[PDB]
Amino acid sequence: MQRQFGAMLQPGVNKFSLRMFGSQKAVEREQERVKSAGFWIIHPYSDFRFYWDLTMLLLMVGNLIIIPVGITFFKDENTTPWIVFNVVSDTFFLIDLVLNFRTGIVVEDNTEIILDPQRIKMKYLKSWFMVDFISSIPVDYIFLIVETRIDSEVYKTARALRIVRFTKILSLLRLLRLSRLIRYIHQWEEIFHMTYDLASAVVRIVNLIGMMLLLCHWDGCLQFLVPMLQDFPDDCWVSINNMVNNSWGKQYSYALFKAMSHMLCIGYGRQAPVGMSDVWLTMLSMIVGATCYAMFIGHATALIQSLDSSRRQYQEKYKQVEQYMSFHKLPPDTRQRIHDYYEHRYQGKMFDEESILGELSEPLREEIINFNCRKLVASMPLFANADPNFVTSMLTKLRFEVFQPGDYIIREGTIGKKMYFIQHGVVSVLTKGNKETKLADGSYFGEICLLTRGRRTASVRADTYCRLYSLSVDNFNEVLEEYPMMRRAFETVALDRLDRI
Amino acid sequence: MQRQFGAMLQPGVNKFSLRMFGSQKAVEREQERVKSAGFWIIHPYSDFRFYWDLTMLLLMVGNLIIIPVGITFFKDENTTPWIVFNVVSDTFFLIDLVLNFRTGIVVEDNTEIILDPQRIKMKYLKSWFMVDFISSIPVDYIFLIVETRIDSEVYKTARALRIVRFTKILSLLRLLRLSRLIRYIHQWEEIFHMTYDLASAVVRIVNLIGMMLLLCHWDGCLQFLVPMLQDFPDDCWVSINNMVNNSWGKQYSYALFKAMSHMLCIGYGRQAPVGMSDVWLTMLSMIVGATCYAMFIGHATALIQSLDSSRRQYQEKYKQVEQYMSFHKLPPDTRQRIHDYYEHRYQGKMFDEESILGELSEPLREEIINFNCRKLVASMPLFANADPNFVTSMLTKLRFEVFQPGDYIIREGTIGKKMYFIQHGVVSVLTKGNKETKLADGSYFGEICLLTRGRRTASVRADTYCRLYSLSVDNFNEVLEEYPMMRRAFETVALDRLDRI
Amino acid sequence: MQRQFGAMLQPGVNKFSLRMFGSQKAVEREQERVKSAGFWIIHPYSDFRFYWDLTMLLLMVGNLIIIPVGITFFKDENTTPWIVFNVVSDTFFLIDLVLNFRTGIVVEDNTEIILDPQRIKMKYLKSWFMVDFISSIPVDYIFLIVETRIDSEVYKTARALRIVRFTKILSLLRLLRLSRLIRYIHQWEEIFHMTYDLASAVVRIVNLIGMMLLLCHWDGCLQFLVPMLQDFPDDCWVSINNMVNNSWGKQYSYALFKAMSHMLCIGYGRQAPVGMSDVWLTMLSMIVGATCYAMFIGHATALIQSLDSSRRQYQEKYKQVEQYMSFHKLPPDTRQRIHDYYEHRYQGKMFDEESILGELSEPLREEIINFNCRKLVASMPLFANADPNFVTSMLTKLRFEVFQPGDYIIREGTIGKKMYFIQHGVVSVLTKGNKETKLADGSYFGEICLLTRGRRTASVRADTYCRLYSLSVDNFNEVLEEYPMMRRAFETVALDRLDRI
Amino acid sequence: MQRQFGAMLQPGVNKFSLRMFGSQKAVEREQERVKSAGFWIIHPYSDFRFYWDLTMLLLMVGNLIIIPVGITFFKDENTTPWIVFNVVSDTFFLIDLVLNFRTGIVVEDNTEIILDPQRIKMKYLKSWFMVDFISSIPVDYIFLIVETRIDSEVYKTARALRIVRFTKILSLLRLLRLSRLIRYIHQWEEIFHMTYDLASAVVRIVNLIGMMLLLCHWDGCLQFLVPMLQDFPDDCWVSINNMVNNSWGKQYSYALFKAMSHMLCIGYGRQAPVGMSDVWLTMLSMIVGATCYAMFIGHATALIQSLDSSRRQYQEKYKQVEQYMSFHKLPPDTRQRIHDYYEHRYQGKMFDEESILGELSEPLREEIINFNCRKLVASMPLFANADPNFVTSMLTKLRFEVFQPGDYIIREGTIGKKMYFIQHGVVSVLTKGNKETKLADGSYFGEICLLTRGRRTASVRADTYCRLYSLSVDNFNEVLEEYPMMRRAFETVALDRLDRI
Ligand SMILES: Nc1ncnc2c1ncn2[C@@H]1O[C@@H]2COP(=O)(O)O[C@H]2[C@H]1O
Numbered sequence A, B, C, D: 001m002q003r004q005f006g007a008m009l010q011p012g013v014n015k016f017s018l019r020m021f022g023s024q025k026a027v028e029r030e031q032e033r034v035k036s037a038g039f040w041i042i043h044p045y046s047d048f049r050f051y052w053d054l055t056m057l058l059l060m061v062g063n064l065i066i067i068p069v070g071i072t073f074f075k076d077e078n079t080t081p082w083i084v085f086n087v088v089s090d091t092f093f094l095i096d097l098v099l100n101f102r103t104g105i106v107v108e109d110n111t112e113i114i115l116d117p118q119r120i121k122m123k124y125l126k127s128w129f130m131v132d133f134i135s136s137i138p139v140d141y142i143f144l145i146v147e148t149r150i151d152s153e154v155y156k157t158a159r160a161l162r163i164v165r166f167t168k169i170l171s172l173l174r175l176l177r178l179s180r181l182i183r184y185i186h187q188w189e190e191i192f193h194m195t196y197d198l199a200s201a202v203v204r205i206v207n208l209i210g211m212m213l214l215l216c217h218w219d220g221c222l223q224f225l226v227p228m229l230q231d232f233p234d235d236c237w238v239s240i241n242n243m244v245n246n247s248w249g250k251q252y253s254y255a256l257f258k259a260m261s262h263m264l265c266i267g268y269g270r271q272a273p274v275g276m277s278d279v280w281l282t283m284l285s286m287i288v289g290a291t292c293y294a295m296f297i298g299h300a301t302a303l304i305q306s307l308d309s310s311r312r313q314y315q316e317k318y319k320q321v322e323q324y325m326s327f328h329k330l331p332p333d334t335r336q337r338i339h340d341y342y343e344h345r346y347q348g349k350m351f352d353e354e355s356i357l358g359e360l361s362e363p364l365r366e367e368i369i370n371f372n373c374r375k376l377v378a379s380m381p382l383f384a385n386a387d388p389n390f391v392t393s394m395l396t397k398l399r400f401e402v403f404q405p406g407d408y409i410i411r412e413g414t415i416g417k418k419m420y421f422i423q424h425g426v427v428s429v430l431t432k433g434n435k436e437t438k439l440a441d442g443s444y445f446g447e448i449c450l451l452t453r454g455r456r457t458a459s460v461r462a463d464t465y466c467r468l469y470s471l472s473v474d475n476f477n478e479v480l481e482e483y484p485m486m487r488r489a490f491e492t493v494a495l496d497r498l499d500r501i
């Protein structure tokens, strides 16, 4: 199954490969560049590297939680389940150390991905090797075997206690897997799409909350560890609180409380620190916890300032309108009319709709505008019996407008520059010496002046909260220069409306 | 009164229905869609649902305040007023549970409101049912009746104490009414208009302050509850502080203090926590309180950064002007003149007046501009004896300008492109070889070049802080192409001013 | 001196009256509206009201600092200096209470200031009267005189102690002068110009720091007051700390420390609170201090986010340029050239110079642009021997540009659309088959194509970091259509440069 | 070597002199202005002043760390190494005091640098002299010599102890070197280029973290100093904790802990403060620490809100698109197509590319656009065999567009206004009654209508995610009016494509 076990190392066709490479042909050329690279090269955008990084993330979170508790609180932490756990974990981390010499490297100086194993080897030895080589191999068990072979009869003196304490210090080199944890979390969050579509403040504050929990855990383990490597002297907090002979659950609970009282800014344990190890560890935890909590307030502020974005923009613009009205001292009748205007026109959410449609492509503009005006097209007798290209070319030129009742849309006897379609509401056509006529949805008005370039023949007044679509002269002549056969519909309607007067 | 008691379930005509549906005809079609739906369907934007949600909000705030204090601090909390209160409340919550199977559901995937009771039933069973069914029914009294019927003679053993403690745990399922509290507060704040016109930061921080008070209250009740369900062991804070036999007022006061010392970041009660229940509850309250206080700092920051919005924009723009002047190293005479210019021209509040008027409709622009220039129209002899359509079409084209004294507005013998009306201040017309003439409010100048396309015949210098209105050539020719009969007024004035020279 | 003592009540000519009214004639009409109002009406923008508010601010800060310390810590606080101080202060506050019935009221619904004493009386009785009438009159001394006259022989029982404690509670009604303090600080900071030119975040955080100091002071006085009105019971912190018989300096110092430990989030005094007065006062101070400190963090954040405004804008735009270069993966040669371009062109501070000049008036634009190009005008032989109107009309059309060395400004044989003046640097004119010629400051190039509409006759390459001024074709033809006599200078230079080839 | 030791005092040619003066000729004129100034004038932008300020920064950080610990914790701090250290440091600070009378002063009111030694002397005596003259000279050793000479036999009384304590107070005048530290850090960070290219929030928070460490250090020294100058009374924290006779390491560690518990908001030392010196010093440290920590939260917030700038802008704009789609209730098919459109078109980072290219100069625009389209130019047969001036003038006019598959790019029989080049993807040309033809990279389409002004002859539909370059009609006619010889290539291709139909 060397074909099946070789297809996982190359970037398969998905949403991510079709996002990062362009089209499927670039994905195929990338796969051909992978297959010709060498002996089993791992592409970083592949399927094996992704789920391998995910299993290593789960294993690193398990190790960085378990390992300090196993080192500090347990006395002879060399039983068979502990050594089996450390050796299985270090087996996986040596496997990942070896596979990092076969992984393509995404470099932010080239559009391509480095797949030459010599450059991969030199760049991986250049920056992130020594910390991964320290963190992968079991340094403590190597040291125990070396100390066994140098002196076989060494475990009967006061040197042996020093060797056990130095073993418990060397076994904390596995906490250098935080580097691989941070790198694999950043790569995984860049690749995995549900965290990619999230807001960056949310992903950033989840990373911070994870790091705060991890540092509070490690700090509690450190608060117990440094008095544990001193035979619990009479001034450390353990011997003062008489927690030397409790269970490890109570020791870990009170040590985590003593660390957490300095992370979330409370303080202290039972008393003030007394011994110098206590004072300097407490000041270390106070620095780390106050920095992490200041960053937590910073991320909470940056998250809260980006929640109700368009509603906040609407309220900022309407607050500027309020301050404009107060600055020019408008009467409260007009202020009430403007309050009703902004709550009818924008409906609480203000959009830069021109820029939003300008970012989109042409068929998406055509599709959205055909969707947003389907009630108009269904209601109007003209658009329902016309060319859909003509309907779309007309609807891309319209402008949404809202008129309060009583407003004069068109004044009788001025030079007209717009043409109105009615989406919603009714209007009253007032003509001097004639009866007013109501117009409703689907009906349009103000088209004789766009055909004849004369002056307005009849005033038009609103009756309800009218929602109209305006059309300029230039766009109307442009769309009729596209389609001169639909001009005769407006000429028929305008001749009939001149016949009514 | 089935007509009167059926008109409340449908959305009546108000500001909210005329905002959310369009006009009154859409409200009537919505009411006809409600009346044809089925057996007593409740519309969510109606009048019954609104005030029913308001009474349920008052009842839930009362329940979530009272119920934990009644469970934790009182010993045999099964007297008649307590059971009457629980049964009346659970009656109201079962009524609201039943009415949620008849309420229209506003879904953010359709412009319509779902009124089909089958879809209402399936969607309500889909997400928010199990928590409301747990929180509505009295689980504890059902459990007491079931335990009574299984064993009648059960209340004489050590099982009975366990049944009483399990009753006090099951009675905390009424604290799952926080879900209905949060949902009904969000719907009520969306509907009720005085919180709708508020800034979203204010409504958001009021919701947070309510939740902080509620979590501090529940946390104090929890800090007493977990030692109360352990017969007050000798390491809990109650038996250490000898508060086992105090009144419930003092127990609740000190428990609320012990919770609140961790909410507002102070710490602790009398001593450090000792027992493991104390340590883990204290760390729980430290997480909850530090998170709520970090969010409180975040909302206070987001509120404070949006208070004096246009004044902050004015000071940002003037700070950029200050840094421009310092970057180009302007002499302090010009810096003083620019400081006086920005404090005369904008008067401390800077508005994007072009965009503010561009968002408004046409009659509101006409009405605001007729208001802001009524001193000019009353002062000028031309505008007070003219067509109000002409006055409005002229005033929409003017541009407000401010000139410091000594400034040359018009230099003698250049090609003129603007025309100035005087709102406030006096100017000196200087002509080579002739006497200067003062012009005051209502008088205009710079109009011969807009009629003749020649060059400027006389320089004009300011005398005070002049507030003028400028008019371009193109707008002047446009407005006279509208109204060619008002051209003769300017031709008469220009012929008289050429006659003066 | 009724003329001299009547000129202070009306707004004199200053920067503030010439800012808020327009010109000096509006100030004179305002003074005539003041003088005709009635019996000694005080204008709110005057000189008497300003310095009267300032003396009342100093007196209120003195009273709100001194009065709680005098009430709480001193036992029989009825010696002659204390009563003289209270009676002199209440004399001033009754004077200000009376003068508030003669002060003009600035209302944010009218451009005018209300000077009718009936509307002043009704509006002042409407909102801010009852709190000022309580805070001005001595309620405690009136109560002592009334209690003296009801029972002369009352000071020999247990009623007398209750009357003394009720006197010390009634004397805290003078702490309702905080309302007048807040109102007069807001009016004074609006009027006084050195705080008006300050950034609003600075003034706002100074107001907050003042309020935080005042609430910490009052809270320390309250922490001592409530145990002082209980004969110091055995569970209050005073009798626990044995501070009942200390001096008042030590009592005030430790009470202010006990309040301040809850304002700046530290906690506590010597121990936890024990009595219920201690617990509820400590929770009150924890609410007040945590709210004030969250607002202090909010104002510090809003202040810090607006300090290096144009430098922050430059670094935001250059960070976007960096991310553009990294997104398109530009080679590091071009990235170094763009880094040098942004550090030569903008010099670390990026200005929206088009908008900054567009906000200014015409003579200020002319004056700034004549200042910023005086080295060019002094260096060029053309501008130093020309019409200053021509120089200014040319300099308003120029555009500043920066070219790195090696760049081809003009390529030989293209259609030219710009004309370059050299402010700084030297260029090499390269012509096919001819020798290169250096051009230096004052010399201009690229003008034959603007006179002849042909194609470029010679390439031009930069030699140093050239700072040039570009001039478009349209502006060049516009300025020569203004002044056709300066065309012959460019025609002479262009004929000479064609003669050189 | 007076030439070599005189070249360091003048600004040499580097990136900084070529940034701040313009070109190398202005640097040479600045050097000639330096050399003619007087007896050894130091230019502030030179090389000697920079590294002299750097050595003084290192020496001031050393002094402000060491000096308070040497004064407070050591008893008879007058051994030979301490006096040698103070005298060597004060020698360097007197040297810097003298050299400040020879340093050019950058004033923010002139483009030039003041090098007149009279103005340098008067301005340096005007503002920053008295604090530098106090901080430079050893006041304590002068006082000891003066007290020795006034009374030789003075060191045998109770006056001598007062003289030693007054010596330890006068020796804290060396802590006024913080002024020179702050000024030299601000000048050094303005000059040194790696901190100049940093974001200002990073430099500002590094300055704040340095000041917080320094104030925590000085506050710990003060917390020990004020009980040290009182013979350790029985109520200070030293005699309560029995730390009077510990080593100075333990005294400094616990004093720094007692200061730091109030800086990072924890509190307290062993108990509450008792003596009045303890209470007022603790309240001083609480003010200073709470202010510094509120500013630290402010700088962390201002840093975090400016990290992923273009990604945050992309997510803000796409959140506005999401709220647009939810506001108009688009069907989820179109929402999925718009999600794929924004993740193909912008790829997670949204740039204002028009403004970014508009800020750049002309050759940098030409170079970036020739880089970003080299795959197109290499792929197209036209551009690879053409004038590079023509290629660049064409590529400056193109517009990048992205079409999803299935989209109709060009509809058959409309009036065409654009011309499409294919960068990536394939399209299907559909013609009525003919076979579809695939077009791939390098091929262009939609050019017959730009040559003939007719209507579209064939529809074009996308097949993959097409990345195209559009070209308008006006730019196409402009570029062919530049180069009429490349029109015949498009005429040949269009005649061949008409021949295919
Ligand atoms: N004697 C005058 N009295 C009033 N206005 C004048 C007089 N002379 C010139 N003006 C005005 O000054 C303007 C300067 O430019 P115009 O000549 O275009 O139009 C001129 C008139 O409006």
Ligand SMILES: Nc1ncnc2c1ncn2[C@@H]1O[C@@H]2COP(=O)(O)O[C@H]2[C@H]1O
Pocket (backbone or CB within 6 Å): D410, D416, D429, D431, D437, D444, D445, D446, D447, D448, D449, D450, D455, D456, D457, D458, D459, D460, D497, D500, D501
């Ligand atoms: N048979 C064809 N092969 C290639 N391109 C074609 C063919 N027919 C039409 N086109 C292209 O499709 C375009 C559609 O609009 P035009 O007719 O303006 O220009 C057309 C050509 O560029």
